[PDB]
Amino acid sequence: TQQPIVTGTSVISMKYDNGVIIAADNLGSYGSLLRFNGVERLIPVGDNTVVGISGDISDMQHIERLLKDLVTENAYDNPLADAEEALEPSYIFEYLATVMYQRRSKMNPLWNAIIVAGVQSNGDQFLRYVNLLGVTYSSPTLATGFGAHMANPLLRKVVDRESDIPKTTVQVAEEAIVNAMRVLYYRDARSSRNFSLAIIDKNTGLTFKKNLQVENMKWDFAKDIKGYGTQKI
Amino acid sequence: DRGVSTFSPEGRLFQVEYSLEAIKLGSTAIGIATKEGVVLGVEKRATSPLLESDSIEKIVEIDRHIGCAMSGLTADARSMIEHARTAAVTHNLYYDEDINVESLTQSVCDLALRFGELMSRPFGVALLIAGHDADDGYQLFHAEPSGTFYRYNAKAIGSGSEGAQAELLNEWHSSLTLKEAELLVLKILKQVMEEKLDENNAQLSCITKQDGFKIYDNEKTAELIKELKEKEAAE
Amino acid sequence: SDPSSINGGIVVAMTGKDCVAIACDLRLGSQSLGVSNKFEKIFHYGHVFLGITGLATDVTTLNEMFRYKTNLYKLKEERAIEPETFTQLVSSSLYERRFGPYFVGPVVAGINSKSGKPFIAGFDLIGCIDEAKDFIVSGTASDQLFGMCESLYEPNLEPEDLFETISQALLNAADRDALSGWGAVVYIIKKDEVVKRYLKMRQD
Amino acid sequence: TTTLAFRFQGGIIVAVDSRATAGNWVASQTVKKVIEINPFLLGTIAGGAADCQFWETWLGSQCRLHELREKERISVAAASKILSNLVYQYKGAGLSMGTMICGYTRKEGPTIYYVDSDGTRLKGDIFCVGSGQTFAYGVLDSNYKWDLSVEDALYLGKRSILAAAHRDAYSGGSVNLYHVTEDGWIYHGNHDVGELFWKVKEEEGSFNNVIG
Amino acid sequence: NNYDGDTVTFSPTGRLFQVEYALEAIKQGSVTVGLRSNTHAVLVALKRNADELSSYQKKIIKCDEHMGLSLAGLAPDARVLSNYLRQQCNYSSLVFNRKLAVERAGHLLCDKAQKNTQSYGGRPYGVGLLIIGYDKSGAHLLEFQPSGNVTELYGTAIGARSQGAKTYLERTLDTFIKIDGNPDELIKAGVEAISQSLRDESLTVDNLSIAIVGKDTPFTIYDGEAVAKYI
Amino acid sequence: MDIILGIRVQDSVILASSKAVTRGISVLKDSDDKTRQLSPHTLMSFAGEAGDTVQFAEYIQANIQLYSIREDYELSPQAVSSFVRQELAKSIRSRRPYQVNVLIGGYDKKKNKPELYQIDYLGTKVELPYGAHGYSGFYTFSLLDHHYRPDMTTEEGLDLLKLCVQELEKRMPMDFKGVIVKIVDKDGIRQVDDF
Amino acid sequence: QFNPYGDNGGTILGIAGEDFAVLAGDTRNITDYSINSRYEPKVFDCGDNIVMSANGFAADGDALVKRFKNSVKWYHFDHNDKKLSINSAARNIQHLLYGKRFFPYYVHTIIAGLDEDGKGAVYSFDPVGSYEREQCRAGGAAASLIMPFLDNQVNFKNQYEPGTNGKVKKPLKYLSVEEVIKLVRDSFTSATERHIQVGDGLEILIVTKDGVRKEFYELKRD
Amino acid sequence: GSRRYDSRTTIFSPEGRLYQVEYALESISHAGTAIGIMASDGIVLAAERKVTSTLLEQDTSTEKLYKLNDKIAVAVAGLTADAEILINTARIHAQNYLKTYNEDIPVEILVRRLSDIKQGYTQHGGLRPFGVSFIYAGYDDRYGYQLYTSNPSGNYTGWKAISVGANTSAAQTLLQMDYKDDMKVDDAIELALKTLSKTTDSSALTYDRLEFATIRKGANDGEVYQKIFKPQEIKDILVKTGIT
Amino acid sequence: GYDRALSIFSPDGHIFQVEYALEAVKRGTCAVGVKGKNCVVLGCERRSTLKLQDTRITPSKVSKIDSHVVLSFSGLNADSRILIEKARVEAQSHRLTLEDPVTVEYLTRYVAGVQQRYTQSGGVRPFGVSTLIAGFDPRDDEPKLYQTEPSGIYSSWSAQTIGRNSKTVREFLEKNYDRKEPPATVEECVKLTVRSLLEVVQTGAKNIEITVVKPDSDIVALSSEEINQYVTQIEQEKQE
């Protein structure tokens, strides 16, 4: 049993017709202090998987090392390491899910919420969640922390059920994600303007976008708001 | 000296092959399987007339549906029987059912090769494990100290084994009754035994679906011995 | 609840001219209930005397432990243990149970057989040695005993005078403590003779 | 839960209720609270359902191993002591069990042992265990004799459970009756309280308080 | 001679005699054949009996839905090693949701057998194994030796008189490899291959044992009247 | 359990122990014998937490019986009491201590003297002319302080014991369902069936 | 302080027919007042004509099902591909649950299938391994809503025959697969209305001698 | 591996003897003779030091007679270093018993414990046995004065008079001749010294070549006193008995 | 730990360490067991090479395992103590858990199991001891007499002997003991036991020990004078 110290906030994601999109801001908070402004919380594994992590950053770095070591171990005595016997999103997720549940069962959890996004060998979209309790679930849209409360509602208007996935393009899906990140910057007190976004497409592969910013914000109406009720000036 | 788990140039484990020689010195035990049941019989072989022969326990119950006969260094069999009984009862606890005869035999045979430098040597005793289950019916198995087990329609082990096995070769057929099998065990035991066969120096047992595993009384066996003498004198 | 004051009891020791004295009460109780009036708290291994206050089960256990150790000492060393050496043995033995201690207040008393020098010492429950010139106190009426000893005591008292001082120190201290009393014993110790006196005191 | 067992002229009567609850929620009305250890040993169960089932099922395995090894059925004393020694190892861990080990042997005769997860093991003639035990004791003690017929003793046990099923909120469902004799136990049916209550009320003239 | 007392002793020519004596136990064992095409992989095993009253010793063991082996030598050692494979296949499934690669399964067996050849007290395994399987890179056939050496092959045979079946497969290499989408013809080639190792005795109904795994075919064993078709 | 008493007279030791066994709001039994014979001339009564009491008593019994067979000799009551004390003194610093208080009444055949030892769960041993555990002593010690004489006969001891039980039955809140009385003397151990 | 348990909501329902059995469960997965997934399968085919669901804390639920599926696999290996009977599976599950008696799987488990006489069978478990064969059982969050309805409509409790007035009970006629599915659908629709953790979708697994069939139905998504 | 160098100390010969035990007894047969004699009013322990030197400090020396507790003593025959290992174990065992039962350990119980330790080294562990034979002289209130002996086999027996070490055959014959049941300590002292004086391999028996001890009830009232004799005291008793 | 396999098979299928343990039993002093109709008697030889012994304190050959069972032996004396101790512990353990004293068969089965365990455990040699275990089961009047040996095999005997010159005394018992009518009284049984030892012992003075065990924990050891009376009567009848 511990308490989380340096923490990362929401990770958000969704499926679209040819793949999956995932995003997370670049902040490492220290309680109310916005301590570290250059933290990458999306960690790619190969050219077909991206693991998005929220919660304790020290534990995130541990998980980052476990995945890095997983790639090394998979390459050992494996001529098809960059082909048929390459690491799949489903393999990477199940490994993490095993670790997360084992650690919670020893009363010494990895204080994180994780989303594994990727594309399988047969072109199928992979998107699944796992957290400190070892709880797992899949859905057309997935989000952690504040994202669950604010991002999912917006992303579910685009893809409400399974049959909406083939009807959703990469442009529409990316637009929804970027909008959701703006809403989180408006309303999450432990978020930052700077974020990273990753797209894993079955045709165009892995596109990793760094140093993105929330833009087109509405603040002008603030000038008209005066006092808290009766005040006019 | 030399290792306990050493291979010979022929590709056999010395200690396992030597334990098989100890089994050849043991008293005779015969098993016969039929569609009406499986019969198990043994030679008691008392070393002296003062020895109370009823205390010689070379036929043993493992569960209600599984019996066992032994031959060789019979002291070694006690831990094997204890393991078999525990395995049978434990499986009933975990699965609310009787355990398959083959599965029980396999569990006993897993102990066999757990020796090295675990126990210090292989077992010096062979077992005839007879029983019944719903899947494969009436069965008879021969469990060696090599860890190997063969299923048999009929089998003899001990000092008069090769002579008895040749006799079982001719006599056994797939339509044998239980009564015919009982007499056949007594017939072959009487042939290979040094001393004259009677109810005190030989023991019978069987396993049926209805009544389960039963060791025969000396009064019941005596009648079957008397029934045997008459039918041999008949022709 | 507090282990050091379930059973109750006291021990006091004093030095005199070429002599030492050690005394104790006889009570053993279960909180308010008085159980035994014959529970002596002073033991001896050869010429070295040990008084022990506190939890009664540990008083008994430690006596048996030091009898054990002083007997082995004597067999190997081929001589009786001295008070200075025994004091160290008590300290060592108590400290090895640092985080699971015997709930006791030991007191050593005796005369060194070679030098003839009078010796007393006190300990806390985990082994700290208090080697006083004048006197040592222990038990549930330690405050009372400190007050009596600090006022009544003077140095270089003769054995028969020292008896009166230590006896009056114990008796009057015990009478101001609910968990002490029910009889008392006083040992007067000289280089080659030891007198043991049971005191008449109020039985409440 | 209400379970009872008492010694008498014709052996032992065992009677139990059938209810299981989680707080105020009635989880089951069809629970088997008598466990058939062997053809001559019965075990009642009260308290934690899983603890009781697991360990009395386990007890049967230990009793079966005994008679394989010793070529002789286990005594009621030895069977009860296996269970009591087991739960004593787990003392403090939070097992919740109250049982009667009931059976007959040649050397002992009809015997009842009360065994409990605190480690208590008591031989006795009459026992009632469970949340509704006091209600059962009221009927049982006022009507008990050594010289009872099998028919009358069975009814008394049935009636004592009914009394507790009525008053105790955590007892009810149905009554399972057993009769243990020299030749083993005999099952005497499941008796639904919903039908048994009105039957007893009318015939016996009891429960005049209730309207029917 | 003086250097065969235990597994921890090299001979003057750099040989490990205890390992070689363990290898000898395989040659005494009954013959078994392995072969594959691009779609399927087949095991064919000649079972041995003690006498006419006895049953025929089982030669093939299932490890997973997509993998299994045939044995030749000490059967209990095959049970230990097959149990280890079952666990390793199972660990891969539970932890990584991944069917164990046949090549990696061979690597694990190699390393397990090796530890027994370098340490004092223990002994080498006295059995040879033919592992077949279908994974993400198609059909596979492996040959395990208790020295530790594991080899991926198109076809092979081990046991007594196994040289005859091995020569046949060496001639038929170009033919049976092309038998794709046809299990019965691949088995026929396996049954015809094991027939080259027979002397005196012939393939009867309770003598023969066949197993197969493929693209849309789980690892299944055929015994009894199920193999009468191929006699 | 509740009340256990002991009294050492001229030529014997008398132990009295309640018959009630109460779990919760019900008296489950009214004929429970809270004692075990450790040896032919040594008897131990006990009271404490449920389960622990019997488990401890029988464990001690087994150990003394083992000693008796090994040496073909009966240990003195003093020796048995010291053994028992050490077990309890060991127990009190265990993971889960034995929560048991005992009285050990024995007749020493060597010294021809009766002996009574009172030992609590902490391992606190005392030899006494009369003893008690729990709330029993709060009533009985005052009576025994008045009446007891060291040269009493066994019959006088039983009368003095009746006077103790009568006081307990009058003033204690719990119904302990009477007592089983046992006498320990030179001839061994016997039970007074009428009390 | 770290709390190793959580509540993923949901509700499951098993009903035993004369020659069939069904095990139903909603597809919603939640934490607190949020929806994790509208379709997260909860009832699983475990082989040997046995279906299983472990409702409550999903992490423990998945772990248990995973371990039982594993137990079925090793039962085949160790006992010559013998079919694991429903009664044997139930006893095995008791030992899996009681094995963690002092750190329990926080789930209510139900399995369904056919007994060795071919008749429909449902077994029900508490978190620590206590079990019991039943003709009818609902488990999980909305179990308190559904079970009473099933006592009434499956076992005909508190129902009597007209004209007799409380004297003659309603006869316990058997229910067909079409009749059972109607009761399952109405049970979940009713539970969805009054329980916030129940909704989104209903997935039913039907077990017969022919095998395991699946049926899916939409539920309210609010 | 290591098997090559294992002597296998705990095995049977074809005749059914324990090799190492037999060879340990052969070692002890060359050790200095020790004699124990039990009387009605006490026990005597006498022992011969092996070929001493004039420069050996005798008064502070102890190779034969050791004290286990106030009531029990032992005479050693064999390897002194081996004996001291066992002696310290026996001293501890006596104290454990005293702590447990609050009574001095009965002589036989102490003897059995040491004998069981020796037995263990012959049946398991693969270690060599202790090359030591003891004569136990002790007293308790059950059996009174007792003499025992134990050897490397772990077998022990009780005696009225007994010898261990060198020339036991000759020594036992002489003891068997002159010993009587109604004998006293003073007479037993004389018998012990006379027996050593005849069996000794030395030219003459002197005070500097002896260790001597008695266990007497000859103590102020009902109690037992152990007397380990000093060099000058051994010299006086040699003149008194008329040997020097 | 020392794990060396001392008890192992040889080419001819023999375990020499177990067989050499029997030779140690052959060397041991003679012990005999005879059961009557309502009693069992255990006779034991004391070699008279050891005089100047203290017979009060010397370990007796017959050991009580419980109040109703006794154990005598032939072979290594030190080894016998280990078996006796284990047996005594198991006897009290059985009473504690089963609430009933051990049967003679059970106690024999335990001791025999311990002996067997030492024939296939690493780093240990077999016990060089064979035992005769005799007594009466609880609440039973049928006499019991069992034998054990280093291998671990055990069996029941109407009458049996072990140790040195046991071949001779077994010859005597085989012709003199009748199964249809065993020694009806205590006298007849003790007489037959003393007679059988007199074939081997040498002198009938302090060389014969007799222990009579009767039902309901009634065990007693005969004194020198009591045994001497049997020796006198046997030889006086023989002079004819």
Ligand SMILES: *[B]([O])([O])[C]([C][C]([C])[C])[N]C(=O)[C]([C]C1=[C][C]=[C][C]=[C]1)[N]C(=O)C1=[C]N=[C][C]=N1
């Ligand atoms: B009975 O009331 O003791 C009963 C017996 C049990 C074998 C079914 N116990 C229960 O009903 C307990 C609750 C309880 C009530 C009163 C006293 C003690 C305990 N219930 C359970 O054990 C249980 C198990 N699984 C599901 C629901 N309840």
Ligand SMILES: [Mg+2]
């Ligand atoms: Mg006071």
Ligand SMILES: [Mg+2]
């Ligand atoms: Mg137990």
Ligand SMILES: [Mg+2]
């Ligand atoms: Mg006290």
Ligand SMILES: [Mg+2]
């Ligand atoms: Mg909603």
